Design a protein around this ligand. Structure first.
Ligand code: ATP
Ligand code: ATP
Ligand code: ATP
Ligand code: ATP
Ligand code: NA
Ligand code: NA
Ligand code: NA
Ligand code: NA
Ligand code: ZN
Ligand code: ZN
Lengths: 430, 429
């Protein structure tokens, strides 16, 4: 009644880690519970491929890459991830006439460069990549089912619009679950297009209602539903997408399956700001990922994001100001591996003593303690800023121990392997 | 009349539903840490007077695999200690024959032992404890046992464990794991904690006279000092179960005057060759170095992955047993060759990425294989069936990669998972 309800998955038969995540469906941190076993079905909104990707895009896809690496590499969940490519869009159509190359060729160019930028940043590719151009037929079938369930109507011009009022009336459906307060051819202004009648000279596709294009949001419901099904464990995106885009996805999918909860956990990354405003192509304040990579390394850019909680906004000071700290941390990690590898290489079993000393025991106690601190940090909504700090403090103490104390060779190797494990989870390469 | 075993409480512990073959219960029981997700683990090390052979490799590689499963796969926190027996009747005898010092001999063969372990991709333990470096702690340990009235001093200057006194206590049982295996001594089954040294043997000072540690006291002393009064895991070859390991439990119980020093005692089966344990005594042994001039580390580790860690295995020489290992290694190598190249050369610009029914079928088999292997590892580290699960998955990936249009992301995900399992096995491709 007047407020959306959320149903936590049952814990029986599920992998229970006591992980808590910031869920935009509850606007709170709640325990994460798989729908089935240790499996996570995850859909993340992808880019609109008409121009270069910038540092703001890097923040979202790197941040959810880190979260994915924590879920899989650290907690041993089984993640099945899908990311779409929006290769049909008003921006793509307009840009293609300006550039006087085919719309498919333009979209394929900037999709190719998007994945190259992701690879440059050590971002894992998803399990599946779904292009709108390859799913238009499935989109048409999806819209047909929504109409059959009486949740969409066809205008005379040949467009199809979602019927918000009819959808709300159903007791099992609520519109705008995550931003309830954000709410001629249409019944009501809040109705949004599932199928757009095509304007002349635009690319178009056949449908039962006439030549047209998919609407802004129908592509994501169709693709996620086809591959992942009627319940998603995780759906992700930047916070700007929460409404209208993500709330409208929930309405479309609920209308298709005629059920109440298409997504269990909705995660939204915070925006990267530059001089107080979201980094955006519109504001012309953006730094491309390629330009960023001519000045800084993949590790340094990922450290920038590791230092900022994924779901909070962050301020990026350009001209290297924000990257001063990132460069210092990367340099100390590189030097740590140089030193510890050298101490291991030069260790002589024949002459050195291996008595387990008080100094050895103290370092070990700090080592196991650091493992538990980092475990709590990851459970605490993927708190990488504090996990990174824990590693820094441990490295500070290993450096002291290596300089003076007689070194336990096995202890140093064990610690090196643990730090490698955490850095693999972070996406750092040393 | 029969020893009791106390399962650790589950409250506050990492619970995986792993079951292990525990020699204290002679059965498979659920593994529960004493504290959190931590595992304090002590494993008996080699007697460093000669080269290590394939039998030694079997025990240490097998427990290396178990360790990698516990840490890499289940995410336990393992604190492992391995001793080096550098003072021993064997070392002393070998050192006089070769006319070199006892320490120089032990340091040579310790060095070759760790080099052989590294060659087999066996991880070093957290701590390495040499007896020569712990003699003083051994003396203090024996003093406490005497103070608790569980050991006595002979006239010659030896110290013997008092089995009869130890048994009498209701909180103590002697020979917990092999109960049926049981002049200067009260009873013949008493064993030395301290041996009075002949003036020509190497020796150390003590309250009872110049002597050497007994065969078993060193492990109780070292494990107790570093790990404490409760060990999550203690491991060794099956031959060590009695008298060596049962005597470790008695010594440590007498020291702490409690009832359970080890929660889980794991014993690897013997590698036999032509029906007899591979042994230096039988002169039937193959050194690890000799083995590595004929076969690779991967092939040798696959040999052990194909045999359950706690069962005996027979090794047929002249390559008979290794034919299967080489075929498996070759099929892994070619699988990685194809999938790595398909990933590297894949072109996103030109390829179509619709999620087809063939993609969905492979993916379903992929997730299914993940669960099969999880059950296999929980089933007392059943690596033979986990390895076969990987083989079956690879057969289907090969079919999919050759003809069907490939999902680049799905192939990468599958590659990373198989790397993950191979890291757990200790294979390198
Ligand atoms: N690493 C993993 N790989 C695959 N599946 C896993 C993994 N870890 C946990 N699972 C799944 O987690 C599910 C729940 O098992 P868990 O360890 O949480 O104990 P449980 O719920 O008490 O046991 P059960 O599933 O037998 O009722 C199991 O079905 C198992 O398949
Ligand atoms: N400045 C930013 N900080 C963090 N995430 C961002 C930022 N800008 C965009 N994102 C996220 O990156 C992804 C890009 O998808 P989107 O469809 O918005 O791209 P685009 O339209 O090409 O770019 P832009 O939003 O700059 O116009 C979305 O998840 C969006 O939330
Ligand atoms: N990967 C890990 N790294 C470090 N410690 C871990 C790890 N996994 C589990 N632990 C430890 O295992 C302990 C067991 O608790 P677990 O998370 O399994 O749930 P619980 O016992 O039901 O909860 P609680 O710990 O709150 O009593 C945790 O407190 C944590 O200290
Ligand atoms: N054939 C074998 N198969 C499996 N494990 C073995 C074999 N031989 C020895 N081991 C184990 O290897 C380790 C070697 O330690 P140990 O003190 O017995 O070595 P050693 O005396 O030099 O060798 P050997 O037992 O051949 O005389 C022990 O854990 C022992 O149980
Ligand atoms: Na309603
Ligand atoms: Na918004
Ligand atoms: Na008794
Ligand atoms: Na025996
Ligand atoms: Zn979307
Ligand atoms: Zn021992």
């Amino acid at each position: 009644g007047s407020l959306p309800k959320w149903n936590q998955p049952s814990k029986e038969g599920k992998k229970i880690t006591n992980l808590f995540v910031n869920n935009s469906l509850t606007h709170s941190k709640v325990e994460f519970i798989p729908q089935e076993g240790n499996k996570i079905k995850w859909y993340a909104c992808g880019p609109t491929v008409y121009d270069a990707a910038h540092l703001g895009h890097a923040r979202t896809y790197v941040s959810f890459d880190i979260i994915r690496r924590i879920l899989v590499n650290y907690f041993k969940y089984d993640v099945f991830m899908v990311i779409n490519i929006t290769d049909i869009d008003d921006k793509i159509i307009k840009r293609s006439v300006e550039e006087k190359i085919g719309f498919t060729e333009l979209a394929r160019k900037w999709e190719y460069e998007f994945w190259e930028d992701m690879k440059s940043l050590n971002v894992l590719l998803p399990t599946a990549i779904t292009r709108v151009s390859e799913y238009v037929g499935d989109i048409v079938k999806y819209i047909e089912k929504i109409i059959e369930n009486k949740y969409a109507y066809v205008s005379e011009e040949g467009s199809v619009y979602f019927d918000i009022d009819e959808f709300k009336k159903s007791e099992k459906h609520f519109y705008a679950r995550m931003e309830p307060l954000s709410v001629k051819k249409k019944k009501n202004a809040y109705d949004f297009a599932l199928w757009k009648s095509s304007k002349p000279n635009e690319p178009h596709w056949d449908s039962p209602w006439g030549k047209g294009r998919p609407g802004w949001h129908i592509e994501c419901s169709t693709m996620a539903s086809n591959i992942l099904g009627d319940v998603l464990d995780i759906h992700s995106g930047g916070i700007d997408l929460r409404f209208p885009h993500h709330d409208n996805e929930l309405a479309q999918s609920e209308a298709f399956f005629d059920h109440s909860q298409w997504v269990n956990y909705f995660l939204h990354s915070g925006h990267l700001h530059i001089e107080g405003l979201k980094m955006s192509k519109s504001l012309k304040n953006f730094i491309t990922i390629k330009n960023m990579l001519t000045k800084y390394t993949s590790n340094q850019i990922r450290i920038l994001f590791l230092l900022n909680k994924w779901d909070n906004f962050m301020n990026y000071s350009p001209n290297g100001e924000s990257m001063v700290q990132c460069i210092e941390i990367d340099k100390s990690f590189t030097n740590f591996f140089a030193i510890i590898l050298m101490k291991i290489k030069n260790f002589d079993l024949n002459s050195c003593n291996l008595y387990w000393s008080d100094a050895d025991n103290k370092l070990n106690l700090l080592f196991r303690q650091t493992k538990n601190k980092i475990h709590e940090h990851f459970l605490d909504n993927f708190n990488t800023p504090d996990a990174l700090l824990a590693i820094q403090k441990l490295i500070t103490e290993i450096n002291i121990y290596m300089d003076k104390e007689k070194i336990q060779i096995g202890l140093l190797l064990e610690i090196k392997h643990y730090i490698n494990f955490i850095f693999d989870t972070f996406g750092l390469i040393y």
